[PDB]
Amino acid sequence: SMSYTWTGALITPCAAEESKLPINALSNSLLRHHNMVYATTSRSAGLRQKKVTFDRLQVLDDHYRDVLKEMKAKASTVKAKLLSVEEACKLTPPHSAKSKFGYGAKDVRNLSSKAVNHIHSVWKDLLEDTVTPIDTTIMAKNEVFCVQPEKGGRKPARLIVFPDLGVRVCEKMALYDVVSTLPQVVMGSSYGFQYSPGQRVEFLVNTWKSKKNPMGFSYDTRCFDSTVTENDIRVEESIYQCCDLAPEARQAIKSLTERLYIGGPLTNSKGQNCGYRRCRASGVLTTSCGNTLTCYLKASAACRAAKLQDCTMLVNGDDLVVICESAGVQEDAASLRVFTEAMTRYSAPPGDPPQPEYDLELITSCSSNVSVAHDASGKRVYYLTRDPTTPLARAAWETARHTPVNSWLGNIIMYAPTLWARMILMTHFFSILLAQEQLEKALDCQIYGACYSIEPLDLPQIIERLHGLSAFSLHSYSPGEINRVASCLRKLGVPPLRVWRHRARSVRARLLSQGGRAATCGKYLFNWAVKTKLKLTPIPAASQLDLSGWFVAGYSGGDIYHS
Ligand SMILES: CC(C)CCn1c(=O)c(C2=NS(=O)(=O)c3ccccc3N2)c(O)c2ccccc21
């Protein structure tokens, strides 16, 4: 079965597309090597089409069926509810793509009669029709990256496939509660989206320590979405159906599976038929849950086929990392080969071949790695970090261009304890916010696929709640981390850390001068910049924050708003 079939109609833009890094008066203070930063556009959609287009074959053995039966057994304990039209509407992002039927995201959120009436008609159609393929729009994503080295210089735009707004609201009603609760029940501690950064680090560290002679590896599946077959998607449906559901929800899920999830026609922004899809749609509510369940199912069975010892997996959609009991460096390499052969038979061939790791800090999963620093008391502290190249390239772009998603904010929140997020991102962006008097302006960012509207002034409390106060006093980072950051800066032409420490003292002083929440930011976020630090005590508002739903499930491409 081919993942896609094309007509020849091009994947078209729905607006003007920029590829070169936009420059303004603030750009050079952050990055000088402008030519190293770019954004993907529809101009490379052709290259992407070739990569994601291929034949899929599956050979399912008993290990596969054994694991699936166990997953279904846990899924049977789940009771999920249907969401009312209003609840589904409120989960819709204010700037979600408008419907082709006379209404947009705001009309949905406002529960306008027109939107609500059309939504009900789509719902009724799903119940009456369980066969007609539902239309979807295919677009080229505009994402920012840094060039080099030998991966062709620049990577092609990724593709996004999504159904109409009316259908998206319907998915929420029938499956929001399911995709939010089922994964954790089925996979337990292996479900990665239930963890905050600190909790993820804790699980990785404790899992690593639970093995006599730990060995670990990340498994990179080549174009995971395209490796997902009709079988996989139907098996996913069988798992959802194991839940205790309202009869109406069962019909809608069966309908969505047959008409949308398994595949359907692809239409470009101009209304032309681009082809047909027979693999995972990247822009549906079940994309994250489906990829997670399927990755976990195939990997769990593969672990058995490979006979890995005391296996512990951590799955986030298509991102997989396994930690197990080492049986010698020789058998470890052989085991991974068997694991890989098993995954392949299941249709999930690897991109980069997997390799055994015997140093937890060298394993990258979800683009991150565990590292260590020290708190005020001098105690060793494990935290999550990553190479800052992409985060910095995106920050440069957002420095001169307002975007729907502010990656710099998401990165500060998730990587608040890191050297680079603290010295560069915080310093740079708070400087910009100060100068524009926009510290109180709520900005959107995405965490685990979901959209959140966050006020920068609330960062101190948010960071305390997610990482603890230690995020404001970590010091003495590892040489490896320091060197990776410093190297990254030289590559992009970003001023050295010493410059940022100097700038931070200024930003800090400026914030303190504003008093109120602004002062709190200067105090907590930049205490690392002064030689004579302070005490930094718990923030009252911190415990007042409603951080519910922040780290429960993944919703990548799920069109979810959690504010
Ligand atoms: C594992 C995290 C603690 C650290 C890395 N990290 C992520 O993995 C993700 C993330 N969200 S997602 O649903 O698209 C997704 C889908 C499938 C596999 C991984 C992710 N990963 C972030 O959206 C993110 C945003 C800001 C900063 C860091 C971040």
Side-chain angles (χ1 to χ4, degrees):
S1 171
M2 293 305 288
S3 50
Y4 295 95
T5 59
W6 310 102
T7 62
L10 308 173
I11 295 178
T12 62
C14 65
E17 293 177 300
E18 288 185 294
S19 59
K20 193 188 68 174
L21 176 70
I23 306 295
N24 67 5
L26 304 170
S27 302
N28 286 324
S29 67
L30 175 61
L31 185 152
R32 286 175 48 267
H33 301 165
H34 307 159
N35 300 312
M36 298 189 73
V37 181
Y38 69 97
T40 61
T41 72
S42 63
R43 284 187 286 290
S44 63
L47 300 183
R48 178 61 62 186
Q49 290 179 75
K50 284 174 169 49
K51 301 179 179 299
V52 307
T53 298
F54 55 77
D55 187 53
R56 291 80 53 69
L57 300 71
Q58 282 188 300
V59 173
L60 309 181
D61 63 351
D62 293 310
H63 284 309
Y64 177 84
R65 285 180 290 284
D66 291 333
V67 172
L68 171 56
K69 181 167 186 180
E70 290 167 38
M71 289 173 76
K72 284 182 177 179
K74 292 183 182 62
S76 294
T77 65
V78 177
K79 181 181 172 60
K81 283 192 171 183
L82 198 63
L83 248 59
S84 68
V85 174
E86 186 178 305
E87 299 176 306
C89 284
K90 299 305 183 174
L91 285 171
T92 301
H95 300 77
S96 180
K98 68 172 188 169
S99 173
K100 299 184 176 185
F101 304 101
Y103 68 87
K106 292 192 170 306
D107 302 309
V108 163
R109 296 184 59 67
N110 292 318
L111 311 175
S112 75
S113 66
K114 185 170 184 55
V116 175
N117 283 314
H118 177 253
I119 291 171
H120 279 97
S121 68
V122 173
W123 183 258
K124 177 179 177 185
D125 182 66
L126 289 173
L127 300 188
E128 313 180 309
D129 188 326
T130 67
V131 186
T132 317
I134 292 174
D135 185 57
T136 68
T137 306
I138 187 173
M139 299 292 284
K141 289 183 181 181
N142 297 140
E143 296 180 296
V144 179
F145 297 100
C146 171
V147 302
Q148 292 290 61
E150 70 299 295
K151 192 172 183 178
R154 299 187 178 185
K155 63 187 64 182
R158 293 194 308 176
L159 272 35
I160 182 69
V161 178
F162 58 100
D164 186 74
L165 178 55
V167 170
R168 297 205 294 283
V169 177
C170 282
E171 295 188 70
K172 292 176 174 63
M173 290 186 273
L175 288 150
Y176 180 72
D177 194 43
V178 170
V179 305
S180 295
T181 67
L182 184 170
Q184 187 286 317
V185 172
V186 171
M187 298 159 60
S189 63
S190 291
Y191 184 52
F193 293 121
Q194 71 185 291
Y195 306 121
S196 63
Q199 301 175 320
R200 182 186 178 83
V201 179
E202 178 178 59
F203 181 67
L204 284 169
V205 171
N206 290 338
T207 297
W208 187 265
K209 294 164 61 174
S210 71
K211 316 302 180 189
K212 308 186 190 68
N213 303 301
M215 180 282 266
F217 66 101
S218 52
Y219 187 80
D220 170 51
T221 297
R222 173 257 289 155
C223 304
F224 189 99
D225 285 359
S226 293
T227 71
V228 177
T229 67
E230 183 183 313
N231 165 81
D232 297 332
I233 299 165
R234 285 181 181 292
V235 161
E236 282 161 15
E237 197 259 3
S238 66
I239 296 177
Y240 305 145
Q241 294 295 351
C242 283
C243 301
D244 179 328
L245 302 160
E248 182 171 49
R250 290 185 184 294
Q251 184 73 346
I253 293 173
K254 170 175 175 292
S255 194
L256 288 170
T257 294
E258 295 297 328
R259 309 173 57 184
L260 173 68
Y261 303 152
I262 288 178
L266 301 163
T267 309
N268 66 16
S269 69
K270 291 182 173 179
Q272 302 175 297
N273 179 200
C274 281
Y276 203 85
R277 167 182 57 84
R278 300 189 195 73
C279 66
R280 171 83 67 218
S282 57
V284 293
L285 180 55
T286 53
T287 297
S288 179
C289 181
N291 279 353
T292 304
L293 287 174
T294 293
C295 182
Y296 175 99
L297 166 53
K298 293 177 178 180
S300 298
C303 286
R304 302 190 176 188
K307 296 180 295 180
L308 271 45
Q309 280 276 175
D310 191 30
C311 280
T312 298
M313 311 192 305
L314 185 54
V315 194
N316 288 71
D318 67 321
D319 192 290
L320 171 76
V321 67
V322 177
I323 296 178
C324 63
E325 200 65 69
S326 183
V329 58
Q330 285 311 321
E331 300 178 59
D332 289 337
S335 294
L336 301 204
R337 272 195 167 193
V338 178
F339 178 87
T340 301
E341 298 180 323
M343 285 299 272
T344 299
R345 288 192 295 272
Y346 299 150
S347 100
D352 311 305
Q355 68 168 294
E357 277 301 325
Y358 302 98
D359 188 323
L360 180 63
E361 293 183 42
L362 298 178
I363 299 178
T364 294
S365 59
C366 281
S367 301
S368 313
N369 67 277
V370 173
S371 196
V372 59
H374 307 276
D375 60 16
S377 296
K379 171 175 64 178
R380 288 170 62 74
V381 179
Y382 290 109
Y383 69 103
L384 206 64
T385 184
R386 66 161 290 166
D387 178 287
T389 301
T390 304
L392 292 178
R394 292 184 176 173
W397 193 289
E398 304 174 326
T399 290
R401 278 280 185 295
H402 293 151
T403 60
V405 179
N406 297 284
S407 76
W408 67 264
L409 182 53
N411 281 321
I412 284 178
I413 292 171
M414 300 292 271
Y415 293 113
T418 68
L419 180 66
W420 53 275
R422 299 172 76 195
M423 295 183 86
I424 304 173
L425 296 187
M426 289 186 189
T427 310
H428 181 68
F429 288 102
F430 267 87
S431 180
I432 293 180
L433 297 179
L434 275 167
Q436 303 303 311
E437 305 188 301
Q438 305 186 314
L439 292 169
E440 304 178 62
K441 179 181 178 182
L443 298 173
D444 298 332
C445 66
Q446 297 193 306
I447 302 177
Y448 288 166
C451 188
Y452 295 87
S453 176
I454 297 171
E455 280 181 42
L457 287 183
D458 290 317
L459 281 172
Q461 310 93 79
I462 293 174
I463 292 172
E464 190 190 322
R465 281 289 295 289
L466 302 190
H467 303 282
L469 284 185
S470 67
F472 304 126
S473 41
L474 294 188
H475 65 80
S476 303
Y477 292 77
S478 77
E481 180 60 18
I482 298 176
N483 291 316
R484 180 168 61 183
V485 175
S487 291
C488 173
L489 311 192
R490 289 187 291 273
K491 175 175 62 185
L492 297 174
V494 171
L497 295 179
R498 60 188 178 68
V499 171
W500 293 100
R501 172 181 270 78
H502 182 66
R503 290 179 186 174
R505 288 164 183 156
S506 163
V507 176
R508 176 177 179 289
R510 259 112 72 56
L511 293 171
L512 297 175
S513 287
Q514 303 240 300
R517 279 106 64 53
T520 300
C521 286
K523 187 174 187 299
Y524 291 67
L525 305 183
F526 298 103
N527 204 195
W528 60 267
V530 297
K531 42 191 176 182
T532 302
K533 283 70 179 183
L534 304 185
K535 62 288 184 57
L536 298 188
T537 63
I539 303 179
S543 66
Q544 194 179 188
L545 287 176
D546 190 308
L547 275 50
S548 65
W550 270 52
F551 304 117
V552 176
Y555 303 97
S556 185
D559 190 40
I560 296 296
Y561 187 73
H562 276 343
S563 293

